[PDB]
Symmetry: D2
Subunit: 298 residues, 4 copies
């Protein structure tokens, strides 16, 4: 019963948003991507408009406004990280609430600036933090309600990844922000507010550091280099995900959309800590570990 | 075992080519597409190089030549239709056989120019004509040849395939990129009709727009009335809402019944498969249709969907 | 003193707009082009911001609104023809008046739609018709107006503009971006004829293709036989001839255009409607055989 | 008489190459740029082919090879810095000598790679080092070489105003431009080598996306240098009068200060500058790009660093 536009519609994650919109009984009425290979749209929302240039998308969305039945209600955003800010800004200024992929924006300063536009427009920004709706993360949050937290995320990526916008630091904002953000969000959701934040290693392939919460001591390691795979996993799974609490090794998008639509979306105030966390990590100066704070893989 | 590069790797058909290369026991060593949303490749060929600019692709391919174990053997092409010609030229000039999607190229003159490059480079161009490998099509071709009845088959071909608004905003909607309905949407149906029914003798067009076209073909063994559309509105009454695509091909009133990209690759790799001389017939057919001056339908030659046009 | 944005800033005609803004005493504060090869801007307005993506230009322009000192007054548009419409729409919706190159838009329906936005936004669209400022066109307009013959002037117009291989590889060679010969090549000539000779009564086309066209226009004051081509084969790298009763017409205007807009004397949708209707008709016309000697001699 | 192609033909520096081709009596037969706003070509080479996609440019250039009268002889390159390498490689592999803008490439390993390609293709790469052609630099080189027991004290300052657009362009992307020292400074470092010999020490004091400064010691010179695209760095007397300030002082004395057409004449006369000539300045900027900043000592700071 609500009308959505989808920006980034031809990319990897966009079909999950297309599916969420359909599965909550809603309508994708406009889609925009600078690449035109988007035919998957016909299998889900065959009557959607499509645009490859933002000028034409924006004019169409503005014309829809003239009729309360046709007007957009939401703009969903799955574009590259650096474009989230102006896509959100335009979405709010169209008179829409906005649903945006993580990382939401790179800096707390940008959050303050979007909160300005929220107030000017009377509209709201929501962020996909889908791990929070997950039954095991809540349980551990419920359960925790100072733990020994060790986090490894190593996800094999082929040569294409560094040739994509995901490998351009100015478009992606780096490993911590692009690959780690929702894992930092998760650690705050379980183990409260951050008190210390130190970085031991950083490259285009990988990153490693120490985070101290009210309730957790967290050592962390992120990588897109297959060679970081433990001997024990090479040859089998392309991804090694290991989160232990004191030693104990611990769809969602449609759910995320459900919560947003019911008025329980995650907004700027909710996204703020993790944006702060990764922003510090991005600019932080590397320092040799101590106190056994440095991830074992370092 | 053989080394492949893939041009157009981020698009819709590309994963069929990646699967064909893997399933035939070969290796995709390099891929190129101007769009970088190509992560599907990791699920099939995790070790492939990837480029978004032709200049870097070409330097890498050239470096691979230095060692006979690493040199490319084939360049597969799934780019937009207008880019087939230069992609093929480049592939042959890199010292590779070339596998290219249909429509191969839009004109017979361009086929002649490609055959020159094959002679110069001593490499060969193959075209994907995957329906030729289909059992039912093979069966009907053989049913037709052995029956050698004295009357032509009466064939009605209708293929209406719903396209949303994105399709006409894409290259497939730019006539200078796609080369139009008959060439982009119809070429493999025309080739199938040739493969089964022999040489084309007459080629007439009754209607042509960016959405749809209709005409009449006469082959040695068939009279074919045809209609092609990407307009959902042309879907017959019974099919609408229930299904996006309507494909009907009747032969003397009876409806025809019918991993073919993998089979295509097997056949090429087995010393068979289809070159310029095989693709030539269909390219001539669509070249004529694309540039045809429309004529009024005579003689019961109009497909039933054009019945109300000026005559 | 007025704040300008310029869209299409890295292109061929753009520096005339940059110089017009500077020379009238105003300020280019924002510029946007998908191509970043824009260094010329330093030599005319060293202080302009620049953007390569519409997303970023639009956010910046919106933010400028928050202070009346920094807010944009005008958005000037030098983009390819098919982009004029959405660029104009966005400009008006940012709260700016809009100055757009010819051809303004391809159809009168689009003019109606833009007049709707003018009313929604309380802003105005102006079109560059800079030939209207040329002394020779003004003198002929005044001569036609003063002379009292009941018989129309007989005008033959020929314009053949050939260019190198790059031209047809550009958006100017894509009929879906350019809108074709009458519209991209002819529009300012049809405007000039209207400006000098009054209302168009009859508009007929004798030949048309993606490369040349020819037809016959009858105005209140003139019978006009016209031929336009980008094909150098047609040359008798440019030939321009406008004859009035057998006599040859004898011939920075963009800075003048800007002075006139800033003076409240710009040409709006009502003024550009005539040439847009003329070219719209020509673009989709069904050809007719030339009769009554209405055929340009080149056909 | 020689046939040229020009890659990057729609850009800022391109028309200087078009003029060099024309004024040495040669023919620009093909041009390629991803942007189509290139009509300046008609004023100089109205018969040139033009392409916006490399695939079509390459096919056309390969077809020209069929007839020795139409075959390309040279490919000239003025594309963004990161594309110099693959453009040069394609040029040599088409059977053409290549003329490439500075910075030639960013690393000495890339130079070694391009020399392999020279050897495989039997063609040559030449580079635009146009300050060597400057009467005033040639004079100082030989002045310096006939004399002196002592080094020359040199301060080099180059400040060239760039507005907001510059860092929005490829010139502002480190992975496309290779940074200020490399993009803006490389032909100065070459000049200093040309005149004062081998580099002994290379120290960097400041680096940002707008400017840089450091200290180079050569066999015959101690050189304090400062480069900037920030108009605020201009000396007060120049602000408002000119957008560029270029100063090279040698023992406190100001050096006494079309070069594209000259560079082309030299290359066509067999006196072009190759990989071996460009290697020194490529090494110098490669070091600067990767250097850890150190405080200035022993008065080695350029005054503008302060
Ligand atoms: N929540 C999750 O679990 C999850 C998983 C993957 C990605 N993501 C996030 O989703 C976003 C998309 O990532 P992706 O993996 O789908 O990458 P992607 O590169 O496959 O898709 C990005 C899409 O953006 C399009 N695009 C580029 N510039 C554009 C513009 N100016 N306007 C409109 N579209 C433009 C590209 O053409 C592409 O189709 C990123 O922010 C990423 O961090 C989230
Ligand atoms: N055999 C069949 O039955 C069949 C089925 C579908 C498509 N096709 C053919 O396959 C080809 C691709 O069709 P598609 O449906 O996958 O379209 P598509 O638009 O999804 O894919 C095209 C790919 O080409 C890339 N591309 C554009 N310009 C390029 C360039 N200069 N270099 C490299 N890549 C470039 C695009 O980014 C896109 O990823 C067409 O020729 C089409 O006719 C054949
Ligand atoms: N008044 C006159 O006499 C006159 C003369 C020449 C051109 N024109 C008109 O001026 C316009 C420009 O013509 P031109 O000759 O300068 O062509 P051009 O191709 O040299 O310049 C066009 C510019 O638009 C930029 N561009 C493309 N898409 C864009 C987008 N989405 N947003 C922003 N910029 C984009 C292009 O990169 C380019 O720099 C056309 O409408 C043309 O008809 C008028
Ligand atoms: N010798 C000198 O004193 C001097 C002076 C200025 C520039 N330069 C050098 O000249 C080169 C060009 O600089 P510029 O200032 O003219 O920049 P520019 O951005 O104005 O020109 C770059 C051109 O390259 C084109 N381009 C981008 N990608 C391309 C591709 N894949 N293929 C073909 N063309 C492509 C761009 O569209 C543009 O027209 C750089 O290496 C620069 O360092 C040298």
């Amino acid at each position: 019963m609500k009308n959505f536009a989808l920006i980034g519609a031809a990319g990897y994650i966009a079909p999950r948003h297309m599916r969420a919109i359909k599965d909550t009984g809603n309508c994708l009425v406009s889609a925009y991507d600078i690449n035109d290979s988007v035919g998957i749209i016909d299998s889900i929302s065959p009557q959607s408009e499509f645009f490859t240039e933002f000028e034409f998308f924006l004019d169409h969305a503005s014309n829809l406004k003239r009729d309360s039945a046709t007007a957009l209600d939401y703009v969903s955003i799955c574009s590259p990280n650096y474009l989230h800010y102006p896509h959100i800004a335009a979405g709010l200024r169209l008179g829409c609430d906005v649903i945006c992929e993580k990382p939401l924006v790179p800096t707390p300063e940008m959050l303050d600036q979007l909160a300005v536009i929220e107030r000017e427009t009377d509209k709201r920004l929501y962020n996909i933090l889908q791990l929070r709706h997950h039954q095991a993360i809540i349980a551990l949050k419920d359960k925790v309600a100072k733990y020994e937290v060790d986090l490894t995320y190593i996800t094999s990526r082929g040569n294409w990844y560094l040739k994509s916008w995901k490998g351009d630091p100015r478009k992606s904002f780096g490993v911590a922000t692009n690959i780690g953000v929702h894992f930092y969000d998760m650690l705050h959701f379980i183990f409260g507010k951050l008190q210390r934040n130190v970085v031991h290693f950083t490259s285009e392939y990988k990153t490693a550091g120490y985070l101290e919460y009210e309730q957790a001591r967290v050592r962390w390691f992120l990588s897109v280099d297959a060679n970081d795979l433990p001997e024990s996993v090479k040859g089998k799974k392309p991804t090694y995900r290991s989160i232990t609490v004191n030693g104990e090794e611990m769809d969602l998008h449609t759910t995320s959309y459900e919560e947003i639509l019911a008025g329980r979306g995650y907004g700027i105030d909710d996204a703020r800590h993790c944006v702060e966390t990764v922003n510090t990590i991005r600019s932080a100066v590397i320092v040799p570990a101590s106190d056994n704070e440095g991830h074992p893989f370092v």
